[PDB]
Amino acid sequence: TPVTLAKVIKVLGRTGSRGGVTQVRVEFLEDTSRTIVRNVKGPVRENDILVLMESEREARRLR
Amino acid sequence: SLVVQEQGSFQHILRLLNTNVDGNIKIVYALTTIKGVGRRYSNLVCKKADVDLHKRAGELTQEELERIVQIMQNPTHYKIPAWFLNRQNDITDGKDYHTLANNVESKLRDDLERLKKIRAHRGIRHFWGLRVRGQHTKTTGRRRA
Amino acid sequence: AVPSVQTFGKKKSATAVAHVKAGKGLIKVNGSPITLVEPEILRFKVYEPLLLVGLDKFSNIDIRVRVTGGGHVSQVYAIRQAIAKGLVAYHQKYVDEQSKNELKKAFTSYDRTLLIADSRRPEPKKFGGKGARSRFQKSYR
Amino acid sequence: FTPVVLATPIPEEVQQAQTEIKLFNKWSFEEVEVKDASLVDYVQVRQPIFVAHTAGRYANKRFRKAQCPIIERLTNSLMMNGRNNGKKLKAVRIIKHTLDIINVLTDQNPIQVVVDAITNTGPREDTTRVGGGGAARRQAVDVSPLRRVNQAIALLTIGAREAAFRNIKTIAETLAEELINAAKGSSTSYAIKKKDELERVAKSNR
Amino acid sequence: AQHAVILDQEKYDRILKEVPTYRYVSVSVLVDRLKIGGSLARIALRHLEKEGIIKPISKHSKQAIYTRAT
Amino acid sequence: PGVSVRDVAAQDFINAYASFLQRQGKLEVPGYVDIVKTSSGNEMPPQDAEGWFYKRAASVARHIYMRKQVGVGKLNKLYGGAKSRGVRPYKHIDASGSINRKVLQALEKIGIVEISPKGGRRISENGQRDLDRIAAQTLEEDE
RNA sequence: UAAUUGCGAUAACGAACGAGACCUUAACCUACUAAAUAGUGGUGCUAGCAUUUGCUGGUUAUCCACUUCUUAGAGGGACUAUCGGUUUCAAGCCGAUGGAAGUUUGAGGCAAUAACAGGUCUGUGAUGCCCUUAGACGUUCUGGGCCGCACGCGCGCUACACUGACGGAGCCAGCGAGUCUAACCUUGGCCGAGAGGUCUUGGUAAUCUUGUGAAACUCCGUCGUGCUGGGGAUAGAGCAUUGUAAUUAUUGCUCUUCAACGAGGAAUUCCUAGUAAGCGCAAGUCAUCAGCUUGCGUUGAUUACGUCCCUGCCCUUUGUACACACC
């Protein structure tokens, strides 16, 4: 079970056709100041711990 | 509250009045499976010929069961109110009748026959195989508590 | 002559009306000892005002409530509210303020509409539908 | 732990818990830590409650839904199907019964077990269907802690319900079974099965 | 017809034996092993309560609930 | 179908009495009782069978107790089942009022209740001192 | 910004309607005005089950005291109020504080200009032209029919079963409505399994019906997985009511047939809070009949709090061989 943490520092906005998915700037304690643009399904604010399966990803703007 | 025991005298799936009384269930309901007896009537019968109503149908003496049978066949002279019977008042002899067993269906057919013979409208509907009650004609019929 | 106060509690259309005075302890309702009440599950709701602050402060007083309107849960909510408000008001008049403040803060932190009433009230039904926002089904074909 | 006398009789069996620190009737909100990372916000436990009724308004602002007590949320989730819409009393009753059942099997705090089940059963990854306009697949995304909680509760309640439906086991029993199974990686539970399904199907997008 | 309704003889003895070995007991558990029907399950449960053996943390009908003697 | 038991010992409050009313040897059964549905919108008779009338006696004793003064029509309204016709869900509908009347007529005889001004019927001071005191003595015994 | 709402910019300048404002209603006034047609408390007469003084009535009479609840009248009250952020730092927006109320506080009513050859001559002694006018499509009496049908399509409301259905012990409401030149709403006592019948009584109504002690649901017992017991159709037989008249059964009850049905392809309807959903209740038609609607409460969820992809709407730019306007 490879698991990684992710604290949300900013939320760029709603994305996708239906708009039930949000672009989020996640950042974790395992080496701070290293960031990803991740897509989140549910409702998200500042200081929300997300459970990541993989670190190396780049969630790009849905079309 | 208290657990009984008993032995191999228990006889499930016994029969009475051309029909099989179902074992391993309460006696009232077991009776109810008979054509011509339903729930309320069965309960009444049980109350009259005093069976222990918690006890199942597969137990109990044959003399008792024949008392029940006697009651079922001969209700009005065993002090049963005479508003309770299914074919109440009747249209031949002019006395109350609880039609029972497979005879009820036969009796029903006889009624349905006499109607057609008479040539009442309802009889004609029956003959045609139509919704006989004069109700709004698009039916199935159901279902609340 | 004797010291006493009276307050109320609301929920939907349920209305509870309390009476408090200086006595021996007695706390009862409509047609109930406060242990029994109804509905056993909810029961503990009626204690909430008594327990959160502490039962020790219901030694010298005598509370008694009567209610009208609503349903069971609603009634319970009303009665508990009445018990609360009646207590705090009693403290306010016949005891010092600091105690009342302590009581409030104990309650208001927990607040299940404990002091203050529930401000939601039934929205009306409108035509072309069984309920308020609900509407009937349409065909096209 | 000092008792107290009063004119009306309040039983000492009941009065004990009332006098001492606050708790669900018998079972306590004390101890009962948040097990997993995340849900240190979106699971309650403190503030405590006597019974899980607490008829306020939660889905109103946006995330006060989170600060609603998790047991009450569970109760709410249990309360549905139309036939069983409203009847919160039934739900709370069955919650209590579930807790009892979870105390009987395995011992320990049943609230803690429930918490564990919640923490496990939320699918850490989840996907959704992109538009396209003809033929498109599931696109891989992350899921929120609140959303994780929501799905956890939903899935447990639904699986428990279906399991009960037309089986001699009551909701109290089936739900309890689901919980106890869901505490660890049992996998025979419905919730965890669904989670697995959601994860494998997610993992089939890279 | 799954049955297991009437007690017979040896099945009562078996119940007497195997009840205290369980952690949890209810009407569902005492029908789960194709044992006694609902009526008897209830009756027998009440009996086992009466005659030591199982300790109630119970409440009401429909959902009955007892535990082992400890 | 019925009213006012939510509070105290719903079943036990009116069970130790039920056998005690038989114990008294004063009760006065209709005769056609115990072969009856108890309501127009019901389906079965009670499962107590050798009893039930004694439950409904203390329940009517409780009814006269309840408040001020009570009548026949009110009792019909109360113990009335509500009637299930076809689709027509469960519209509130009167009871087997005759039974309640019979119960009243019994209770009046036993020295518990009497006919009041403003119509209706009211509890006596001598009345329930002995009747439901022994049944609720179980609550006094446990206490 | 819900909004041609504003802030601003500026060959425009001031203006009018619509929106908003306004009206009713929903909630907060332990302040004013009071109230036996609304309550509560104290004193003479009650303490009979959980009671020692639940709460109740004894108590239209026992007199007094009161207005928190209940009713209204008059006013106050919320203005995004205070704090923080955020923005040419402006209009505004997001969070926090208090607050009964902080989504224009919710809900409605009212709702512009120009249209459609939308519906209605079966609401109208509203009417044009046409038709008919005493074997009259006029008016009226007798008897049918509009209910002719296991449905070819459309809406509609109980619990497919153990968060169940029973047997009881179940169960607090709120809109209403109500007799006169008569027979409406029925309390009360008797009889009746029953529906009902009867003798009367109260009421032109915050007083009497009527705390419409409604239903779902709280508590124990009865089944417990089985087109069975769960609950009482389709067909028969009787007994009631309403009405000149019930027959192609008006309704209601009673017993016998026993059925909430095996979670409903493709498809498509409504839904974001006291809502959806559950559940009854009254009124509207009414002699009688509700499953119809119109309101009312009761229990009370999940899930967003977003987007323009589908279905459409508004504006601006543009393109147009269209203008009965992309059918």
Coordinates of N, CA and C in Angstrom, one line a residue, chain D residues 8-183:
Chain D
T8 N -38.2 14.3 43.0 CA -38.5 13.3 42.0 C -37.4 12.3 42.0
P9 N -37.7 11.0 41.8 CA -36.6 10.0 41.8 C -35.9 9.8 40.4
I10 N -34.7 10.2 40.3 CA -33.8 9.9 39.1 C -32.9 8.7 39.5
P11 N -33.1 7.5 38.8 CA -32.3 6.3 39.1 C -30.8 6.5 39.1
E12 N -30.1 5.9 40.0 CA -28.6 6.0 40.2 C -27.9 5.3 39.0
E13 N -28.5 4.3 38.4 CA -28.0 3.6 37.2 C -27.8 4.6 36.1
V14 N -28.8 5.4 35.9 CA -28.8 6.5 34.9 C -27.9 7.7 35.3
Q15 N -28.1 8.1 36.6 CA -27.6 9.3 37.1 C -26.1 9.3 37.2
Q16 N -25.5 8.2 37.3 CA -24.0 8.1 37.3 C -23.3 8.8 36.1
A17 N -23.7 8.3 34.9 CA -23.1 8.9 33.7 C -23.5 10.4 33.6
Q18 N -24.6 10.8 34.1 CA -25.1 12.2 34.0 C -24.1 13.0 34.8
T19 N -23.8 12.5 36.1 CA -23.0 13.2 37.0 C -21.6 13.4 36.5
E20 N -21.0 12.2 36.0 CA -19.6 12.2 35.6 C -19.5 12.8 34.2
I21 N -18.3 12.6 33.5 CA -18.1 13.2 32.2 C -19.1 12.7 31.1
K22 N -19.4 13.5 30.1 CA -20.5 13.2 29.2 C -20.1 12.1 28.2
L23 N -21.2 11.4 27.8 CA -21.0 10.2 27.0 C -22.3 9.7 26.3
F24 N -22.2 8.8 25.3 CA -23.4 8.2 24.8 C -23.9 7.1 25.8
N25 N -24.8 7.5 26.7 CA -25.5 6.6 27.5 C -24.6 5.7 28.4
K26 N -24.0 4.7 27.7 CA -23.0 3.9 28.3 C -21.6 4.2 27.7
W27 N -21.5 4.1 26.4 CA -20.2 4.2 25.7 C -19.7 5.6 25.6
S28 N -18.4 5.8 25.8 CA -17.7 7.1 26.0 C -17.0 7.6 24.7
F29 N -17.1 9.0 24.6 CA -16.3 9.7 23.6 C -14.9 9.9 23.9
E30 N -14.5 9.7 25.2 CA -13.1 9.7 25.7 C -12.3 8.6 25.0
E31 N -11.0 8.9 24.9 CA -10.0 8.1 24.0 C -10.5 8.2 22.6
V32 N -10.5 7.1 21.8 CA -11.1 7.0 20.5 C -10.4 8.1 19.6
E33 N -9.2 7.7 19.2 CA -8.4 8.6 18.4 C -8.7 8.5 16.9
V34 N -8.4 9.6 16.1 CA -8.6 9.5 14.7 C -7.4 8.7 14.1
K35 N -7.7 7.6 13.5 CA -6.7 6.6 13.1 C -5.8 7.1 12.0
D36 N -6.4 7.3 10.8 CA -5.7 7.6 9.6 C -5.4 9.0 9.4
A37 N -4.4 9.3 8.6 CA -4.1 10.7 8.1 C -5.3 11.2 7.2
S38 N -5.6 12.4 7.3 CA -6.9 13.0 6.9 C -8.0 12.6 7.8
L39 N -9.2 13.2 7.6 CA -10.4 13.1 8.5 C -10.1 13.6 9.9
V40 N -9.2 14.5 10.1 CA -8.8 15.1 11.4 C -9.5 16.5 11.4
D41 N -10.8 16.5 11.2 CA -11.6 17.6 10.8 C -13.0 17.1 10.4
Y42 N -13.0 16.2 9.4 CA -14.2 15.7 8.8 C -14.9 14.5 9.5
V43 N -14.2 14.0 10.6 CA -14.8 13.2 11.6 C -14.9 13.9 12.9
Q44 N -16.0 13.8 13.6 CA -16.2 14.6 14.8 C -15.5 13.9 16.0
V45 N -16.3 13.3 16.9 CA -15.8 12.8 18.2 C -15.1 13.9 19.0
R46 N -15.9 14.4 20.0 CA -15.7 15.8 20.6 C -16.0 16.8 19.6
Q47 N -17.2 17.5 19.6 CA -18.1 17.4 20.8 C -18.9 16.1 20.9
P48 N -19.2 15.6 22.1 CA -20.0 14.4 22.3 C -21.5 14.7 22.3
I49 N -22.3 13.6 22.3 CA -23.8 13.7 22.3 C -24.4 12.5 23.1
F50 N -25.5 12.8 23.7 CA -26.2 11.7 24.5 C -26.8 10.7 23.5
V51 N -27.6 11.2 22.7 CA -28.2 10.4 21.6 C -28.0 11.1 20.2
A52 N -28.0 10.4 19.2 CA -27.7 10.9 17.8 C -28.9 11.4 17.1
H53 N -29.6 12.4 17.7 CA -30.8 13.0 17.1 C -30.4 14.4 16.6
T54 N -30.2 15.3 17.5 CA -29.5 16.6 17.2 C -30.1 17.3 15.9
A55 N -31.4 17.5 15.9 CA -32.1 18.0 14.6 C -31.8 19.5 14.4
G56 N -30.7 19.8 13.9 CA -30.3 21.2 13.5 C -30.2 21.3 12.0
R57 N -29.4 22.3 11.5 CA -29.2 22.5 10.1 C -27.7 22.5 9.8
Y58 N -27.3 21.6 8.8 CA -25.9 21.3 8.6 C -25.5 21.5 7.2
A59 N -26.2 20.9 6.3 CA -26.1 21.2 4.8 C -26.9 22.5 4.6
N60 N -26.1 23.6 4.9 CA -26.7 25.0 4.8 C -25.6 26.0 4.3
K61 N -24.5 26.1 5.0 CA -23.4 26.9 4.5 C -22.6 26.1 3.4
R62 N -21.8 25.2 3.8 CA -21.1 24.3 2.9 C -20.4 23.1 3.6
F63 N -19.5 23.5 4.5 CA -18.7 22.5 5.3 C -19.0 22.4 6.8
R64 N -20.1 23.0 7.2 CA -20.6 22.7 8.6 C -21.2 21.3 8.6
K65 N -21.6 20.7 7.5 CA -21.8 19.3 7.3 C -20.8 18.4 7.9
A66 N -19.5 18.8 7.8 CA -18.4 18.1 8.5 C -18.5 18.1 10.0
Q67 N -18.7 19.3 10.5 CA -18.7 19.5 12.0 C -19.9 18.9 12.7
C68 N -20.9 18.4 11.9 CA -22.0 17.6 12.4 C -21.4 16.3 13.0
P69 N -22.0 15.8 14.1 CA -21.4 14.5 14.7 C -21.6 13.3 13.8
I70 N -20.5 12.5 13.6 CA -20.5 11.4 12.7 C -21.5 10.4 12.9
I71 N -21.9 10.1 14.2 CA -22.9 9.2 14.5 C -24.2 9.6 13.9
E72 N -24.5 10.9 14.1 CA -25.8 11.5 13.6 C -25.8 11.3 12.1
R73 N -24.7 11.6 11.4 CA -24.6 11.4 10.0 C -24.9 10.0 9.5
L74 N -24.3 9.1 10.3 CA -24.5 7.6 10.0 C -26.0 7.3 10.1
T75 N -26.6 7.8 11.2 CA -28.1 7.6 11.4 C -28.9 8.1 10.2
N76 N -28.5 9.3 9.8 CA -29.2 10.0 8.7 C -29.1 9.1 7.4
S77 N -27.9 8.6 7.2 CA -27.6 7.7 6.0 C -28.4 6.5 6.1
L78 N -28.6 5.9 7.3 CA -29.4 4.7 7.5 C -30.9 5.0 7.2
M79 N -31.3 6.2 7.5 CA -32.7 6.7 7.3 C -32.9 7.0 5.8
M80 N -33.2 6.0 4.9 CA -33.7 6.3 3.6 C -34.3 5.0 2.9
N81 N -34.9 5.2 1.7 CA -35.6 4.3 0.9 C -37.1 4.6 0.6
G82 N -37.6 5.7 1.2 CA -39.0 6.2 1.0 C -39.8 5.6 2.1
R83 N -40.1 4.3 2.0 CA -40.6 3.4 3.1 C -40.0 3.8 4.4
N84 N -38.7 4.1 4.4 CA -37.9 4.5 5.6 C -37.3 5.9 5.5
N85 N -38.1 6.9 5.0 CA -37.8 8.3 5.0 C -38.5 9.0 6.2
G86 N -37.7 9.8 6.9 CA -38.1 10.2 8.3 C -37.9 8.9 9.2
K87 N -38.5 8.9 10.3 CA -38.3 7.8 11.3 C -36.9 7.8 11.8
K88 N -36.4 9.0 12.3 CA -35.1 9.1 12.9 C -35.0 8.3 14.2
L89 N -36.1 8.1 14.9 CA -36.1 7.3 16.1 C -35.7 5.9 15.8
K90 N -36.2 5.3 14.7 CA -35.9 3.9 14.3 C -34.4 3.8 14.1
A91 N -33.9 4.8 13.3 CA -32.4 4.9 13.0 C -31.5 4.9 14.2
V92 N -31.8 5.9 15.1 CA -31.1 6.0 16.4 C -31.1 4.7 17.1
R93 N -32.3 4.1 17.2 CA -32.5 2.8 17.9 C -31.5 1.7 17.3
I94 N -31.5 1.6 16.0 CA -30.7 0.7 15.3 C -29.2 1.0 15.4
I95 N -28.9 2.3 15.5 CA -27.5 2.7 15.8 C -27.1 2.2 17.1
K96 N -27.9 2.4 18.1 CA -27.7 1.9 19.5 C -27.5 0.4 19.5
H97 N -28.4 -0.3 18.8 CA -28.3 -1.8 18.7 C -27.0 -2.2 18.0
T98 N -26.6 -1.5 16.9 CA -25.4 -1.8 16.2 C -24.2 -1.7 17.1
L99 N -24.2 -0.6 17.9 CA -23.1 -0.3 18.9 C -23.0 -1.5 19.9
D100 N -24.2 -1.9 20.4 CA -24.3 -3.0 21.3 C -23.6 -4.3 20.7
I101 N -24.0 -4.6 19.5 CA -23.6 -5.7 18.7 C -22.0 -5.7 18.6
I102 N -21.5 -4.5 18.3 CA -20.1 -4.3 18.1 C -19.3 -4.3 19.5
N103 N -20.0 -4.1 20.6 CA -19.4 -4.3 21.9 C -19.4 -5.8 22.2
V104 N -20.4 -6.5 21.8 CA -20.6 -8.0 22.1 C -19.4 -8.7 21.4
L105 N -19.4 -8.6 20.1 CA -18.3 -9.2 19.3 C -17.1 -8.3 19.5
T106 N -15.9 -8.9 19.6 CA -14.6 -8.1 19.6 C -14.3 -7.3 20.9
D107 N -15.3 -7.0 21.7 CA -15.2 -6.0 22.9 C -14.7 -4.6 22.4
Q108 N -14.1 -3.8 23.2 CA -13.6 -2.5 22.8 C -14.7 -1.5 22.6
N109 N -14.3 -0.2 22.4 CA -15.3 0.8 22.1 C -15.9 0.6 20.6
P110 N -17.2 0.5 20.5 CA -17.8 0.4 19.2 C -17.7 1.6 18.3
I111 N -17.8 2.8 19.0 CA -17.5 4.0 18.3 C -16.2 4.0 17.6
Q112 N -15.2 3.5 18.3 CA -13.8 3.5 17.7 C -13.8 2.6 16.5
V113 N -14.5 1.4 16.6 CA -14.6 0.5 15.5 C -15.3 1.2 14.3
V114 N -16.3 1.9 14.5 CA -17.0 2.7 13.5 C -16.1 3.7 12.8
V115 N -15.3 4.4 13.6 CA -14.4 5.3 13.1 C -13.4 4.7 12.2
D116 N -12.9 3.5 12.6 CA -11.9 2.7 11.9 C -12.5 2.3 10.5
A117 N -13.7 1.9 10.6 CA -14.5 1.5 9.4 C -14.6 2.7 8.4
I118 N -14.9 3.8 8.9 CA -15.0 5.0 8.1 C -13.7 5.4 7.5
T119 N -12.6 5.3 8.3 CA -11.3 5.7 7.8 C -10.8 4.7 6.7
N120 N -11.1 3.4 6.9 CA -10.7 2.5 5.8 C -11.6 2.6 4.6
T121 N -12.9 2.5 4.7 CA -13.9 2.3 3.6 C -13.9 3.5 2.6
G122 N -13.4 4.7 2.9 CA -13.4 5.8 1.9 C -12.3 5.5 0.8
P123 N -12.8 5.5 -0.5 CA -11.8 5.2 -1.5 C -10.9 6.3 -1.8
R124 N -9.6 6.2 -1.4 CA -8.6 7.2 -1.5 C -8.4 7.8 -2.9
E125 N -8.6 7.0 -4.0 CA -8.7 7.5 -5.3 C -10.1 7.2 -5.9
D126 N -10.5 8.1 -6.8 CA -11.8 8.0 -7.5 C -11.8 8.7 -8.8
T127 N -12.6 8.2 -9.8 CA -12.6 8.7 -11.2 C -14.0 9.2 -11.6
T128 N -14.0 9.9 -12.8 CA -15.3 10.4 -13.3 C -15.2 10.5 -14.9
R129 N -16.4 10.5 -15.5 CA -16.5 10.5 -16.9 C -16.3 11.9 -17.6
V130 N -15.3 12.0 -18.4 CA -15.1 13.2 -19.2 C -16.1 13.3 -20.3
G131 N -16.4 14.5 -20.7 CA -17.4 14.8 -21.8 C -17.1 14.2 -23.1
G132 N -16.2 14.8 -23.9 CA -15.8 14.4 -25.2 C -16.9 14.7 -26.3
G133 N -18.0 14.0 -26.2 CA -19.1 14.2 -27.2 C -19.2 13.1 -28.2
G134 N -19.3 11.8 -27.7 CA -19.5 10.7 -28.5 C -19.0 9.4 -27.8
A135 N -17.7 9.3 -27.5 CA -17.1 8.2 -26.9 C -15.9 8.7 -26.0
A136 N -16.0 8.5 -24.7 CA -15.0 9.0 -23.7 C -14.9 8.0 -22.5
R137 N -13.8 8.0 -21.9 CA -13.5 7.1 -20.8 C -13.4 7.8 -19.4
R138 N -13.2 7.1 -18.3 CA -13.0 7.6 -17.0 C -11.7 8.3 -16.9
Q139 N -11.7 9.6 -16.4 CA -10.4 10.3 -16.2 C -10.1 10.2 -14.7
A140 N -8.8 10.0 -14.4 CA -8.3 9.8 -13.1 C -8.1 11.1 -12.3
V141 N -8.7 11.1 -11.1 CA -8.5 12.3 -10.2 C -8.4 11.8 -8.8
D142 N -8.2 12.8 -7.9 CA -8.2 12.6 -6.4 C -9.6 12.8 -5.9
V143 N -9.8 12.5 -4.6 CA -11.0 12.7 -3.9 C -10.8 13.4 -2.6
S144 N -11.8 14.2 -2.2 CA -11.7 15.1 -1.0 C -11.8 14.2 0.3
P145 N -11.3 14.8 1.4 CA -11.5 14.1 2.7 C -13.0 14.0 3.1
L146 N -13.7 15.2 3.0 CA -15.1 15.2 3.2 C -15.8 14.2 2.3
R147 N -15.5 14.2 1.0 CA -16.1 13.3 0.0 C -15.8 11.9 0.4
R148 N -14.6 11.6 0.8 CA -14.2 10.3 1.3 C -15.1 9.8 2.4
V149 N -15.3 10.7 3.4 CA -16.2 10.4 4.5 C -17.6 10.1 4.1
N150 N -18.1 10.9 3.1 CA -19.4 10.9 2.6 C -19.7 9.5 1.9
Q151 N -18.7 9.1 1.1 CA -18.8 7.9 0.4 C -18.7 6.7 1.3
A152 N -17.8 6.8 2.3 CA -17.6 5.8 3.3 C -18.9 5.5 3.9
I153 N -19.6 6.5 4.5 CA -20.8 6.4 5.2 C -21.9 5.8 4.3
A154 N -22.0 6.4 3.1 CA -23.0 6.0 2.1 C -22.8 4.6 1.8
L155 N -21.6 4.1 1.5 CA -21.4 2.8 1.0 C -21.7 1.8 2.1
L156 N -21.2 2.1 3.4 CA -21.5 1.2 4.5 C -23.0 1.1 4.7
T157 N -23.7 2.2 4.7 CA -25.1 2.2 5.0 C -25.9 1.4 3.9
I158 N -25.5 1.6 2.6 CA -26.1 1.0 1.5 C -25.9 -0.6 1.5
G159 N -24.6 -0.9 1.6 CA -24.3 -2.3 1.7 C -24.9 -3.1 2.8
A160 N -25.0 -2.4 4.0 CA -25.6 -2.9 5.2 C -27.1 -3.2 4.9
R161 N -27.7 -2.2 4.3 CA -29.1 -2.2 4.0 C -29.5 -3.3 3.0
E162 N -28.8 -3.4 1.9 CA -29.0 -4.4 0.9 C -28.8 -5.8 1.5
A163 N -27.8 -5.9 2.3 CA -27.5 -7.2 3.0 C -28.6 -7.6 3.9
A164 N -29.2 -6.6 4.7 CA -30.3 -6.9 5.5 C -31.6 -7.3 4.7
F165 N -31.9 -6.5 3.7 CA -33.1 -6.7 2.9 C -33.4 -8.2 2.5
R166 N -34.5 -8.7 3.0 CA -34.9 -10.1 2.8 C -33.9 -11.1 3.4
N167 N -33.3 -10.8 4.5 CA -32.5 -11.7 5.3 C -32.8 -11.5 6.8
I168 N -32.8 -12.6 7.6 CA -33.3 -12.6 9.0 C -32.5 -11.6 9.8
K169 N -31.2 -11.4 9.5 CA -30.4 -10.4 10.2 C -31.0 -9.0 10.0
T170 N -31.2 -8.3 11.1 CA -31.7 -6.9 11.1 C -30.6 -6.0 10.6
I171 N -31.0 -4.7 10.4 CA -30.1 -3.7 10.0 C -29.0 -3.6 11.0
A172 N -29.4 -3.6 12.3 CA -28.4 -3.6 13.4 C -27.3 -4.6 13.3
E173 N -27.7 -5.8 12.9 CA -26.8 -6.9 12.8 C -25.9 -6.8 11.6
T174 N -26.5 -6.7 10.4 CA -25.8 -6.6 9.1 C -24.8 -5.4 9.1
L175 N -25.3 -4.3 9.6 CA -24.5 -3.1 9.7 C -23.3 -3.3 10.6
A176 N -23.5 -4.0 11.7 CA -22.5 -4.3 12.7 C -21.4 -5.2 12.0
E177 N -21.9 -6.2 11.3 CA -21.0 -7.1 10.6 C -20.1 -6.4 9.6
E178 N -20.7 -5.5 8.9 CA -20.0 -4.7 7.9 C -19.0 -3.8 8.5
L179 N -19.3 -3.2 9.7 CA -18.4 -2.4 10.4 C -17.2 -3.2 11.0
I180 N -17.4 -4.3 11.7 CA -16.4 -5.1 12.2 C -15.5 -5.7 11.1
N181 N -16.1 -6.1 10.0 CA -15.3 -6.5 8.9 C -14.5 -5.3 8.3
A182 N -15.1 -4.2 8.2 CA -14.5 -2.9 7.6 C -13.4 -2.3 8.5
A183 N -13.4 -2.7 9.8 CA -12.3 -2.2 10.7 C -10.9 -2.6 10.2

